[PDB]
Coordinates of C-alpha atoms and ligand atoms in Angstrom, one line a residue:
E1 CA 5.4 30.5 0.5
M2 CA 9.0 29.3 -0.1
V3 CA 10.6 26.1 1.0
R4 CA 14.1 25.3 -0.3
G5 CA 14.0 27.4 -3.4
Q6 CA 10.6 26.1 -4.4
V7 CA 7.1 27.5 -4.1
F8 CA 4.7 25.8 -1.7
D9 CA 1.8 28.3 -1.7
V10 CA -0.7 26.7 0.6
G11 CA -1.4 29.9 2.5
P12 CA -3.1 31.6 4.1
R13 CA -4.7 28.7 5.8
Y14 CA -1.5 26.5 6.2
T15 CA 1.5 28.3 7.5
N16 CA 4.8 27.7 9.5
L17 CA 6.1 25.3 7.0
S18 CA 8.8 22.7 7.7
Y19 CA 10.4 20.5 5.1
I20 CA 10.1 16.8 5.9
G21 CA 10.9 14.9 2.7
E22 CA 10.4 14.1 -0.9
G23 CA 7.5 12.1 -2.3
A24 CA 6.5 10.7 -5.7
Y25 CA 6.1 14.0 -7.6
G26 CA 7.2 16.7 -5.2
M27 CA 8.2 17.6 -1.7
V28 CA 6.3 16.9 1.5
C29 CA 6.0 19.5 4.3
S30 CA 4.4 19.7 7.7
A31 CA 2.4 22.9 8.1
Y32 CA 0.2 24.6 10.7
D33 CA -3.4 24.3 9.8
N34 CA -4.9 27.6 11.2
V35 CA -8.5 26.3 10.9
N36 CA -8.0 23.0 12.8
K37 CA -5.2 24.4 14.9
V38 CA -2.9 21.4 14.5
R39 CA 0.1 20.6 12.3
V40 CA -0.6 18.5 9.1
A41 CA 1.2 17.0 6.2
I42 CA 1.0 18.5 2.7
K43 CA 2.2 16.7 -0.4
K44 CA 3.0 18.8 -3.4
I45 CA 2.1 16.8 -6.5
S46 CA 3.1 17.8 -10.1
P47 CA 1.9 14.9 -12.3
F48 CA 0.6 16.6 -15.4
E49 CA 3.6 16.1 -17.7
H50 CA 3.4 12.4 -17.6
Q51 CA 0.3 10.3 -18.2
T52 CA 1.2 7.6 -15.6
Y53 CA 1.7 10.2 -12.9
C54 CA -1.7 11.5 -13.8
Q55 CA -3.2 8.0 -13.4
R56 CA -1.7 7.3 -10.0
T57 CA -2.8 10.8 -8.8
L58 CA -6.3 10.5 -10.0
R59 CA -6.6 6.9 -8.6
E60 CA -5.3 7.8 -5.1
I61 CA -7.5 10.9 -4.9
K62 CA -10.7 9.0 -6.0
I63 CA -10.2 6.1 -3.6
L64 CA -9.0 8.1 -0.6
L65 CA -12.0 10.5 -0.8
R66 CA -14.3 7.6 -0.7
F67 CA -12.6 5.4 2.0
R68 CA -13.1 6.3 5.6
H69 CA -11.2 4.1 8.1
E70 CA -9.0 4.6 11.0
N71 CA -6.2 2.5 9.5
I72 CA -6.2 4.3 6.2
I73 CA -4.8 7.8 5.6
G74 CA -7.5 10.3 4.6
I75 CA -7.4 13.4 2.5
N76 CA -8.4 16.4 4.5
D77 CA -8.1 19.1 1.9
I78 CA -6.8 19.7 -1.7
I79 CA -5.3 22.9 -2.9
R80 CA -5.2 23.7 -6.7
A81 CA -5.5 26.7 -9.0
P82 CA -9.0 28.2 -9.8
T83 CA -8.6 27.4 -13.6
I84 CA -7.3 24.3 -15.3
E85 CA -4.6 26.1 -17.3
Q86 CA -3.1 27.5 -14.2
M87 CA -3.1 24.1 -12.4
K88 CA 0.5 23.0 -12.4
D89 CA 0.6 21.5 -8.9
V90 CA -1.8 19.8 -6.6
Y91 CA -1.4 20.0 -2.8
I92 CA -2.8 17.2 -0.8
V93 CA -3.4 17.8 2.9
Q94 CA -3.4 14.8 5.3
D95 CA -2.9 14.0 8.9
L96 CA 0.7 14.4 9.9
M97 CA 2.3 11.0 10.6
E98 CA 5.6 11.0 12.5
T99 CA 7.3 8.2 10.6
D100 CA 6.7 4.9 8.8
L101 CA 7.5 1.2 9.2
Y102 CA 10.4 1.3 6.8
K103 CA 12.2 4.1 8.8
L104 CA 11.2 2.3 12.1
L105 CA 12.7 -1.0 11.0
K106 CA 16.0 0.7 10.2
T107 CA 16.4 1.8 13.9
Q108 CA 14.6 -0.8 16.1
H109 CA 14.0 -4.5 16.6
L110 CA 10.3 -4.8 17.3
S111 CA 9.0 -6.8 20.3
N112 CA 6.5 -9.6 19.6
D113 CA 3.7 -7.5 21.2
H114 CA 4.4 -4.6 18.9
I115 CA 4.6 -6.8 15.8
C116 CA 1.3 -8.4 16.8
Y117 CA -0.6 -5.2 17.1
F118 CA 1.0 -3.6 14.0
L119 CA 0.0 -6.7 12.0
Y120 CA -3.6 -6.4 13.4
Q121 CA -3.8 -2.8 12.3
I122 CA -2.5 -3.6 8.8
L123 CA -5.1 -6.4 8.4
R124 CA -7.9 -4.3 9.9
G125 CA -7.3 -1.7 7.3
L126 CA -6.9 -4.3 4.6
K127 CA -10.2 -5.9 5.6
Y128 CA -11.9 -2.6 4.9
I129 CA -10.0 -2.2 1.6
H130 CA -10.9 -5.7 0.4
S131 CA -14.6 -5.3 1.5
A132 CA -14.7 -2.5 -1.0
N133 CA -13.5 -4.9 -3.7
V134 CA -10.3 -2.9 -4.0
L135 CA -6.7 -4.2 -4.1
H136 CA -4.0 -2.0 -2.7
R137 CA -1.2 -3.8 -4.7
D138 CA 1.8 -2.0 -3.2
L139 CA 1.8 -2.8 0.5
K140 CA 5.2 -2.5 2.0
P141 CA 6.9 -0.9 5.0
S142 CA 7.2 2.7 3.6
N143 CA 3.4 2.6 2.8
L144 CA 2.6 2.0 6.5
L145 CA 2.7 5.4 8.2
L146 CA 3.0 5.5 12.0
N147 CA 2.7 7.9 14.9
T148 CA 3.0 5.3 17.7
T149 CA 2.7 1.6 18.3
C150 CA -1.1 2.1 18.4
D151 CA -1.5 4.4 15.4
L152 CA -0.8 2.9 11.9
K153 CA -2.3 4.1 8.6
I154 CA -1.9 2.5 5.2
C155 CA -1.1 5.0 2.5
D156 CA -0.2 5.4 -1.3
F157 CA -3.2 4.0 -3.2
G158 CA -1.7 5.2 -6.5
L159 CA -1.6 1.7 -7.8
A160 CA -4.8 0.4 -6.4
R161 CA -7.3 -1.5 -8.6
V162 CA -10.8 -2.9 -8.3
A163 CA -10.4 -6.6 -7.9
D164 CA -10.9 -8.6 -11.1
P165 CA -10.0 -12.3 -11.1
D166 CA -10.6 -12.6 -14.8
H167 CA -7.9 -10.2 -16.1
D168 CA -5.9 -11.2 -18.1
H169 CA -4.9 -8.8 -19.6
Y170 CA 3.2 -0.6 -14.3
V171 CA 4.6 -2.8 -11.5
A172 CA 4.4 -2.9 -7.8
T173 CA 7.5 -3.3 -5.5
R174 CA 9.5 -6.4 -6.5
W175 CA 10.4 -7.7 -3.0
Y176 CA 6.7 -7.8 -2.0
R177 CA 5.4 -9.2 -5.3
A178 CA 3.3 -12.4 -5.1
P179 CA 4.6 -15.4 -7.2
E180 CA 1.4 -15.6 -9.3
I181 CA 2.0 -12.0 -10.6
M182 CA 5.4 -13.1 -12.0
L183 CA 4.1 -16.5 -13.2
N184 CA 0.8 -15.4 -14.9
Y185 CA -6.0 -8.9 -10.0
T186 CA -6.8 -10.9 -6.9
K187 CA -7.0 -10.1 -3.2
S188 CA -4.4 -12.8 -2.6
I189 CA -1.6 -10.5 -3.9
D190 CA -2.1 -8.1 -0.9
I191 CA -2.1 -11.0 1.6
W192 CA 1.3 -12.1 0.1
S193 CA 2.6 -8.5 0.5
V194 CA 1.5 -8.4 4.1
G195 CA 3.2 -11.8 4.7
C196 CA 6.4 -10.3 3.4
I197 CA 5.9 -7.4 5.8
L198 CA 5.4 -9.7 8.7
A199 CA 8.6 -11.6 7.9
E200 CA 10.4 -8.2 7.6
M201 CA 9.2 -7.2 11.1
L202 CA 10.4 -10.5 12.5
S203 CA 14.0 -10.0 11.4
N204 CA 14.6 -6.3 10.2
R205 CA 15.4 -7.4 6.7
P206 CA 13.4 -8.1 3.5
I207 CA 12.6 -11.8 3.4
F208 CA 12.9 -12.0 -0.4
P209 CA 15.2 -9.3 -1.7
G210 CA 15.4 -10.3 -5.4
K211 CA 17.5 -8.2 -7.9
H212 CA 15.1 -8.8 -10.8
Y213 CA 11.9 -10.9 -11.2
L214 CA 13.7 -14.2 -11.9
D215 CA 15.9 -13.6 -8.9
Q216 CA 12.8 -12.8 -7.0
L217 CA 11.2 -16.2 -7.8
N218 CA 14.6 -17.8 -6.9
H219 CA 14.5 -16.2 -3.4
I220 CA 10.9 -17.3 -2.9
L221 CA 11.6 -20.9 -3.9
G222 CA 14.8 -20.8 -1.9
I223 CA 12.6 -20.6 1.2
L224 CA 9.3 -22.3 0.4
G225 CA 11.1 -25.1 -1.5
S226 CA 10.5 -26.2 -5.1
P227 CA 6.8 -26.0 -6.0
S228 CA 4.6 -29.1 -6.1
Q229 CA 3.1 -30.5 -9.3
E230 CA -0.3 -29.3 -8.2
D231 CA 0.9 -25.8 -7.7
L232 CA 3.0 -26.1 -10.9
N233 CA -0.1 -26.9 -13.0
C234 CA -1.8 -23.7 -12.0
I235 CA 0.6 -21.5 -14.0
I236 CA -1.1 -19.9 -17.0
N237 CA 1.9 -19.4 -19.2
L238 CA 4.5 -22.0 -20.2
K239 CA 7.5 -20.5 -18.5
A240 CA 6.9 -21.4 -15.9
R241 CA 6.6 -25.1 -16.8
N242 CA 9.0 -25.2 -18.4
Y243 CA 11.7 -22.9 -17.2
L244 CA 11.9 -24.1 -13.5
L245 CA 10.9 -27.0 -14.0
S246 CA 14.6 -26.5 -15.0
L247 CA 16.4 -25.6 -11.7
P248 CA 17.9 -27.4 -8.8
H249 CA 15.4 -28.9 -6.4
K250 CA 15.0 -27.1 -3.1
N251 CA 13.6 -28.1 0.2
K252 CA 11.3 -26.0 2.4
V253 CA 13.3 -24.1 5.0
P254 CA 11.4 -24.5 8.3
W255 CA 10.1 -21.1 9.5
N256 CA 11.5 -21.6 13.0
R257 CA 14.9 -22.2 11.5
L258 CA 14.7 -19.0 9.6
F259 CA 13.1 -17.2 12.6
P260 CA 14.5 -18.9 15.7
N261 CA 13.2 -16.2 18.1
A262 CA 9.7 -15.7 16.7
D263 CA 6.4 -16.5 18.3
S264 CA 5.3 -19.9 16.9
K265 CA 1.7 -18.6 16.2
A266 CA 3.2 -15.7 14.2
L267 CA 5.2 -18.2 12.2
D268 CA 2.0 -20.3 11.6
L269 CA 0.2 -17.2 10.3
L270 CA 3.3 -16.2 8.3
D271 CA 3.1 -19.7 6.7
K272 CA -0.5 -19.2 5.6
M273 CA 0.2 -15.8 4.1
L274 CA 3.3 -16.9 2.3
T275 CA 1.9 -19.9 0.4
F276 CA 2.8 -20.2 -3.3
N277 CA -0.6 -21.1 -4.6
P278 CA -2.9 -18.1 -4.3
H279 CA -6.0 -20.2 -4.1
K280 CA -4.7 -21.8 -0.9
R281 CA -3.4 -18.6 0.6
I282 CA -5.2 -17.3 3.7
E283 CA -7.8 -14.6 3.2
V284 CA -8.0 -11.3 5.2
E285 CA -10.8 -12.3 7.5
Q286 CA -9.2 -15.7 8.2
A287 CA -5.9 -13.9 9.0
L288 CA -7.7 -11.6 11.4
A289 CA -9.2 -14.7 13.1
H290 CA -5.9 -16.5 13.4
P291 CA -4.8 -17.3 17.0
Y292 CA -1.8 -15.0 16.7
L293 CA -4.3 -12.1 16.6
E294 CA -7.0 -13.4 19.0
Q295 CA -6.4 -10.8 21.7
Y296 CA -7.4 -8.1 19.1
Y297 CA -9.9 -9.8 16.7
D298 CA -13.3 -8.2 17.1
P299 CA -15.6 -8.2 14.0
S300 CA -17.9 -5.7 15.8
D301 CA -15.1 -3.2 15.8
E302 CA -13.8 -3.9 12.3
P303 CA -15.7 -1.7 9.8
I304 CA -16.2 -2.7 6.2
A305 CA -17.2 -0.6 3.2
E306 CA -20.8 0.5 2.7
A307 CA -20.8 -0.2 -1.0
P308 CA -18.3 -2.1 -3.2
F309 CA -16.1 0.3 -5.2
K310 CA -16.4 1.0 -8.9
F311 CA -14.6 3.8 -10.7
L312 CA -10.9 2.1 -17.4
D313 CA -7.6 3.7 -18.5
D314 CA -5.7 4.4 -21.6
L315 CA -6.6 8.1 -21.4
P316 CA -4.2 10.9 -22.5
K317 CA -2.7 13.1 -19.7
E318 CA -5.0 16.0 -20.9
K319 CA -8.2 14.0 -20.2
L320 CA -6.8 12.8 -16.9
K321 CA -6.0 16.4 -16.0
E322 CA -9.7 17.4 -16.4
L323 CA -10.7 14.4 -14.3
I324 CA -8.3 15.4 -11.5
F325 CA -9.8 18.9 -11.9
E326 CA -13.3 17.4 -11.5
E327 CA -12.5 15.2 -8.4
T328 CA -10.9 18.2 -6.7
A329 CA -13.6 20.7 -7.4
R330 CA -15.2 19.5 -4.1
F331 CA -12.6 21.6 -2.2
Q332 CA -13.0 24.8 -4.2
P333 CA -15.2 27.8 -3.3
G334 CA -18.6 27.7 -5.0
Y335 CA -18.8 24.0 -5.5
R336 CA -22.3 22.7 -6.1
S337 CA -24.2 19.5 -6.9
Ligands
LIG1 N1 0.5 11.9 6.1 C1 1.8 12.0 6.0 N2 2.7 12.3 7.0 C2 3.9 12.3 6.5 C3 5.2 12.5 7.0 C4 6.3 12.4 6.2 CL1 7.9 12.7 6.9 C5 6.2 12.1 4.9 C6 5.0 11.9 4.3 C7 3.8 12.0 5.1 O1 2.5 11.8 4.9

């Protein structure tokens, strides 16, 4: 019941606990699941003090319970107190994943074969996600869990949103942030993130590691070159245009110069994913159908969602608490309807 001076309390079903790390709002352990007779991961989540924590928790739970896909982490079980007032923590049980792409990239240079199949698995999961009209919004190496080269699962849907092109209208990770987000809710933002992930696999370093959002745009233009007038016009803001229109002119760095050892087909796909103008950026199905992925592409083995997803939110943390209580009742004794 105790791990490192803190209560876990997932028993009696989950025992033989072993600390593995920290997450958003609490520790993560591996545990022995006595029912399924296998070790699992359990995240302890304590979001109730802060409204935003409650939002991400509710969002991730609602989405993950509805998605069912081999490249997306599932939720196996949810532990919580019998009464709301007693509910201070939520324990989310999921398949144990050995590591993630962020940890992996710190220790290994990936072969072209491994990059190719990792990329396929990411886009296969993304295809399902986008077919449900959902945007992940925070794709990055630490959100790609791994057991082996053939076993990748996208995780952390705490920031996911239903796609909504007309909106307008908390941030997603700067280095993986699409230029349109900084310059003015579309599927294209996830494709950009995946492109940053592909570039990172090719060289073991973030392609665009900006310090702040203007520095981020600077890194992007530093490689793609100064934006064209056509791409410049499609900026709903003034700043940009003006404001850079206001900086030195920059030429496009050729991808093969930036990545001299990379497969030319990988670089061709990378080029389509990392295009400034989101309207011209490659879409998920197109990316799966790219020659780089032709040895894997198989629409008959690439499930999509049954029904498009529909859940807005400026709700106080007390109303969200009840909603988390409702979504998790499923896993309680005596649940009906
Ligand atoms: N599913 C899952 N497996 C995990 C393993 C670690 Cl080390 C951390 C978080 C995890 O989440």
